Write a protein that binds this ligand. Sequence first.
Ligand SMILES: Cc1ncc(C[n+]2csc(CCOP(=O)(O)OP(=O)(O)O)c2C)c(N)n1
Ligand SMILES: Cc1ncc(C[n+]2csc(CCOP(=O)(O)OP(=O)(O)O)c2C)c(N)n1
Ligand SMILES: Cc1ncc(C[n+]2csc(CCOP(=O)(O)OP(=O)(O)O)c2C)c(N)n1
Ligand SMILES: [Ca+2]
Ligand SMILES: [Ca+2]
Ligand SMILES: [Ca+2]
Ligand SMILES: [Ca+2]
Ligand SMILES: [Ca+2]
Ligand SMILES: [Ca+2]
Ligand SMILES: [Ca+2]
Ligand SMILES: [Ca+2]
Ligand SMILES: [Ca+2]
Ligand SMILES: [Mg+2]
Ligand SMILES: [Mg+2]
Ligand SMILES: [Mg+2]
Ligand SMILES: [Mg+2]
Ligand SMILES: [Mg+2]
Ligand SMILES: [Mg+2]
Ligand SMILES: [Mg+2]
Ligand SMILES: [Mg+2]
Lengths: 524, 524, 524
Amino acid sequence: ASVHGTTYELLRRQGIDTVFGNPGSNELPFLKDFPEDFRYILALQEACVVGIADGYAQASRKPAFINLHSAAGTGNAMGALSNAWNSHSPLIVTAGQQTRAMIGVEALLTNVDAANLPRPLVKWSYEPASAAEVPHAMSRAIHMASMAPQGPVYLSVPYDDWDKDADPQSHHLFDRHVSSSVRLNDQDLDILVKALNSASNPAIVLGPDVDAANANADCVMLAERLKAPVWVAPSAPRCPFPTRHPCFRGLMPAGIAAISQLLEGHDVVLVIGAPVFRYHQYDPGQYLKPGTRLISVTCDPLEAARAPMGDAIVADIGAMASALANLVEESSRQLPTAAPEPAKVDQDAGRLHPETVFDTLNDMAPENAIYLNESTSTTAQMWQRLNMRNPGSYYFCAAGGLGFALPAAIGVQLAEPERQVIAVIGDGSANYSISALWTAAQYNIPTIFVIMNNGTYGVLRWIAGVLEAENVPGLDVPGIDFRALAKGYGVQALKADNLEQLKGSLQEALSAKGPVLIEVSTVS
Amino acid sequence: ASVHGTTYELLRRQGIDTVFGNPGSNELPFLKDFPEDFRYILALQEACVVGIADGYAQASRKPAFINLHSAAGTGNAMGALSNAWNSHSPLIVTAGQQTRAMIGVEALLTNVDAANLPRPLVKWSYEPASAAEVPHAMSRAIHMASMAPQGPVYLSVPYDDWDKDADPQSHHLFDRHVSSSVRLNDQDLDILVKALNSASNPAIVLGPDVDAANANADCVMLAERLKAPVWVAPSAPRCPFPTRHPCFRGLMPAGIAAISQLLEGHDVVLVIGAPVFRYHQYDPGQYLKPGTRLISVTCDPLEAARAPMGDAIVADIGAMASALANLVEESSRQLPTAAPEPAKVDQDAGRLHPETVFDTLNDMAPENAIYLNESTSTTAQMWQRLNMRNPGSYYFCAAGGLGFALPAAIGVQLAEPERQVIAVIGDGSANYSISALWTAAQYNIPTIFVIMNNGTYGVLRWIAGVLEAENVPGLDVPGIDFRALAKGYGVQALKADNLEQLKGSLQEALSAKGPVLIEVSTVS
Amino acid sequence: ASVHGTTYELLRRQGIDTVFGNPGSNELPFLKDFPEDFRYILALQEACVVGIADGYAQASRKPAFINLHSAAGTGNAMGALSNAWNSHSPLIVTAGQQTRAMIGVEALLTNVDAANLPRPLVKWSYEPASAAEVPHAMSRAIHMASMAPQGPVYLSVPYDDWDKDADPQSHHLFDRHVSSSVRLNDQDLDILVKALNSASNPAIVLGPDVDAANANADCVMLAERLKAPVWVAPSAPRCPFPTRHPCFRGLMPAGIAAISQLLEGHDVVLVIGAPVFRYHQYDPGQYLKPGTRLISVTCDPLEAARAPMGDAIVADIGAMASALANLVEESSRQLPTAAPEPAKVDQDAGRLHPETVFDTLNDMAPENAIYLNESTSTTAQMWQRLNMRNPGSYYFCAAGGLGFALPAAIGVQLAEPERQVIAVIGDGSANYSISALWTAAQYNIPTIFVIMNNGTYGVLRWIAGVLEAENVPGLDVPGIDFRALAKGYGVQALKADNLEQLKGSLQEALSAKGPVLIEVSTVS
Ligand SMILES: Cc1ncc(C[n+]2csc(CCOP(=O)(O)OP(=O)(O)O)c2C)c(N)n1
Ligand SMILES: Cc1ncc(C[n+]2csc(CCOP(=O)(O)OP(=O)(O)O)c2C)c(N)n1
Ligand SMILES: Cc1ncc(C[n+]2csc(CCOP(=O)(O)OP(=O)(O)O)c2C)c(N)n1
Ligand SMILES: [Ca+2]
Ligand SMILES: [Ca+2]
Ligand SMILES: [Ca+2]
Ligand SMILES: [Ca+2]
Ligand SMILES: [Ca+2]
Ligand SMILES: [Ca+2]
Ligand SMILES: [Ca+2]
Ligand SMILES: [Ca+2]
Ligand SMILES: [Ca+2]
Ligand SMILES: [Mg+2]
Ligand SMILES: [Mg+2]
Ligand SMILES: [Mg+2]
Ligand SMILES: [Mg+2]
Ligand SMILES: [Mg+2]
Ligand SMILES: [Mg+2]
Ligand SMILES: [Mg+2]
Ligand SMILES: [Mg+2]
């Protein structure tokens, strides 16, 4: 068998059936004879390729496979890899290299020192030393991406390797099963359970690895048993809990002092599937107030090591959440009271308040909708105003890197064809990966894109105001016609300049057979 | 509190009480006011510092703390770090940096791009961005070294940071407990146990992480229940099993074909705490024969990913071994029969056969002796001829890097004062870290060093013969007087030119109050 | 032709005829059939291998070739590479890798991520992607080491590559000539010359790249024409000027304030072949006083970029020094007056003051002796007391990393068989690379080693005193018998406990046919 044939068999045997890519000449020898049982999803720029694959992997809860062109294609994707690292997304990134005989002279298209290029944003990065090693290296890539803590990996392959003979002993790779589905030993788990049972006023904080593990329902059971309020850890990339459950308390503010104040009076705080903590703003103060003990369950040693406080347990989130939910006592304390509905912001017949947009989406969208957020000044209101009952209902760029949501929404919609995906994206953010729209058109992936157009990088104007920073350039983005961009890439386009038009456009979009972009005029 | 005071409190609260070091000026501000409850162990060269610390960590089963001088001191230690990486040794390597104000001009003693220097041989490598970050960075280092899979880490600290004010909130670091003591979830563990119970002819292969976890006794129980032969995985850095137990089958040859042949007819092979596999010689063939399934339990994702065959489970070796030993059925098959005693090699009244040396050590040494091996042509015979009943009884350079055993034997002896340490070291290997002898003299650490003097790099002459490689330079090392080297560093020195003298010298050495070196004339 | 044959032909055609090495199994396929016209120089540890090669390269003013064993051998050499980087030493470091078929499984002796291992201490680091690339990669290594700014490079070669067929077109590599012998364009050079001619009170500062270029005599002419005092730049790795020439002003103190004060009143300061500046101690103040302009000529862009003051010209030191010396006007100012002889320190009949040792060496040594310094508390006095008339007469560890001088003195003596090499090494420093002594014995390289034994890391005790740092551990090194160490490695050993014995021992050493070590009892 050839390296080509062996590698595709390995991929198929390991459950991979889709290649997200933007092709080049170093990749043609890999892409030729493309298997009839695989799908290729083309995107027009590599940030888009990786974003689509990332959304697909996150929503499918399985690895996604990417093929890019040498250094320039890899390089174009590195912002996307920054997000993927923070979301623990299991992405297998392959890039074609020059033929081995031309690497030394650094022919055009040589990826120099290739494995160093994507560092430090990958778990493993490698170029094999021979053609017959390629299937083994691919096996390593698959497993490295997939083991806890999941994350992106990189493999560079000289284009002449594909046609060479494989090692017949590579067949042992095909059916390897590698598990990291582990949990704390019984003795120490019993100690933890007793500490949770004995707590007088426990709180729970959940992060994105809960949703990645589909541990959401187990966390609901845990919170109900402990009668504990539940927060989502700051800078949330996913939604780990039903947002109208009585225990839910919303998104934690991403500040040191704000979080210790919120946790004051809680004697034990159990954090599951989050860094401790993904703070953002400068908000100096105490990590915890006196009287609060924190215990973190994380899938990632790097998270456990860097927490500035608390105990930690490094284990699989699904296995731990299930074990805890089934072991803790039913507390006789009263169940927390649900948060009240948010206020309705006064809305005239003109430009839309973001609150109006979210309220309207919540009213009109199906109960199993999936939302993506890249409307950076409106996140708090989004979190208050969308009732997200189900797992996998929210994504936000995990490293804060713009250009995620537009392509990722396409990948999520591909992963979840029965769930309507609605991406709410600022006018600034929309440009970073605008060409991703074409993939939705070409493959008829019926994502709805809601562009919040206020003409500016609004959160940056806000921060500049707080900082008292005057004379900052580059914060306004006037003069972008998003309906024309949508037409450019073949996506149906609507506008909404007021609430009546918003409702009309959403009605049209929800019933459409293809992707739709709605340009919403929002308050500036 | 100062950064100095806070950092030493963190170290003490995390169980560190010893600093292995070779000082320099960038380290004086750290070493000043050295705490009265800490011990400093000086060695004369940094390979020696790290080797001593490594032996101490491996034998104590706890992290060891190292302080080196900038780039040159770190650099001198990098061969030692190569071994430490392969043995999963929990080493916290700190190095002093220039004062922050002089780093930009690259003053003498500046460690340029410091965190990259020890890569790729460390789990984590870092220089903090401010003085007040130093205690937090130290906390990260401690936990990164200590979490499974354990390994060396590196922290560079500008010398002016120590006297600066610490963050008062660093007190939250002091008592953090971080656990990776995890095992496979119950459902999947029950599947594994059923597969072991159903095997008709199981075999067990054990690696160094078993001995590191002190899982040896649990593995004895497991092997007895399964009635299974037990091998030690190739290139063994430690001894994971009693070598005269009836199930023991010795050291696996480090070749692909040799191992698949050895495992032929075993339907399930359970590998615990080893890479799959640390092959060495070129010995192409099948990874496994038809009819053999392999299942690996490893603490290291990198091991699980790179195995060319078998299933894998990534979990703590101690937790897994205990769980398996207590869950499997007692097989009604007959217990394996003990290996017979090895043959006595004919020995005249002249130079010693290595077999004679090992037989004599086995006769005369206490039953709780600890052996180190850096006698590279004699490893197979050593493994056959030493009855090692207890855990922690054997160490061999885990990356094959010479210069480990001489210093490591000192660190092991420091860790285990009641167990006589005997390092068996070739005349070639003895030179790499010869100055370590001084530390044994200075601190009166009563290690016995047995120098096997045959005048040559014997295993290289052997390999050159197999390869039919003629005219190879540099394989002979005549003209070294090891008794004079021992005198040079203040260690009592004996010679043994024949068996009678070997017995006499060993008798003297075993009853000595300090370290002793015996130069043995072995067959060439 | 094989890769082996082609590579050795390339080496020979590029002027390489010596391999400095410590062998291992990955290197046996390279070392077999070793060419009869090459020499192999064995050393017993890799810091020693690289130090010997470094001294040889520095003194010969040509590249030196090194062969080490995989990661552990490379790692043992990294402290030596730290010095080599700072001295711009043209070292071609090769290391053997596992056979390509075993790299993926990380067999024992695999150098993982090999090219990253020696970073950041090499100019270029590489592992070829195929066997036929090896000769081209070797060509790249040779030229990268040799082009200005010279420095160490690293090449990792899988052991199976050597026996493979080479590309016949590799013959084009053999006779390539690559020049960096460049100087500033005429127009801008004329501007510089006019600025030097117009200076009222010029000063010259010279660094190690002057001695490396053998630009010393041109710098003498330049200083004589300009009637300018001449200093050696701080932390000097080499001696660039005759130390009793009337213009010579000695070693600059390695402090910011001290240097600007020394240069005060000099209107133009011309720095040639030095960083600006290799400061050491914290000595904050002005980089230059008002009225001083600095102009630097450096072979190294990294030096030019990081200078905190002055103009810079990046060019070959030999070409620039010759051009300037021949273009400047003869100033009618008076030639500077020679420094007076240093004082004689009172010396009783007991332990030796270091000043006494240097005065005695200066009296008794030949006028073409070559000195190496690793006696760290005595450098200032050494510089004042040795009359070094000729180029290539002084070496000191360029990164401050101990373990350089003992092996480097052997390499210098090998390079310069007619010039007596005398290494003056502290008792602390002597241990780092003590096994290098064996190479001097084995090859009968007649270096004289003068061990300054004061029982302590003296400069560290001194600095601790200045810092007012109390309770510092690890600063004393009692109990080392250097005559026994010398006997251990087959080197003739003498002692000197007082001046009469020093003179007697030096007389014996200077007339000896082989290497000699003299242990001198110096004041503590
Ligand atoms: C790749 C990338 N570049 C720049 C930024 C900085 N950034 C953060 S938010 C923001 C403004 C986004 O504006 P918009 O999407 O219109 O949302 P608004 O703040 O107006 O709600 C910018 C540029 C970033 N996070 N990522
Ligand atoms: C740091 C380092 N350098 C070189 C080697 C290569 N090496 C492997 S075994 C060996 C010979 C050791 O000789 P000796 O200790 O006398 O034992 P013998 O083979 O004679 O039993 C050498 C040099 C290595 N493994 N590590
Ligand atoms: C590899 C290395 N480790 C440690 C140091 C720190 N160091 C600088 S000077 C010095 C003391 C050397 O003592 P010695 O050679 O006896 O000379 P003395 O200071 O007594 O004159 C030490 C350990 C270093 N520069 N390089
Ligand atoms: Ca509503
Ligand atoms: Ca799906
Ligand atoms: Ca906006
Ligand atoms: Ca016996
Ligand atoms: Ca102990
Ligand atoms: Ca030997
Ligand atoms: Ca004199
Ligand atoms: Ca010469
Ligand atoms: Ca000294
Ligand atoms: Mg990079
Ligand atoms: Mg293959
Ligand atoms: Mg258990
Ligand atoms: Mg490195
Ligand atoms: Mg602090
Ligand atoms: Mg379970
Ligand atoms: Mg060739
Ligand atoms: Mg010109």
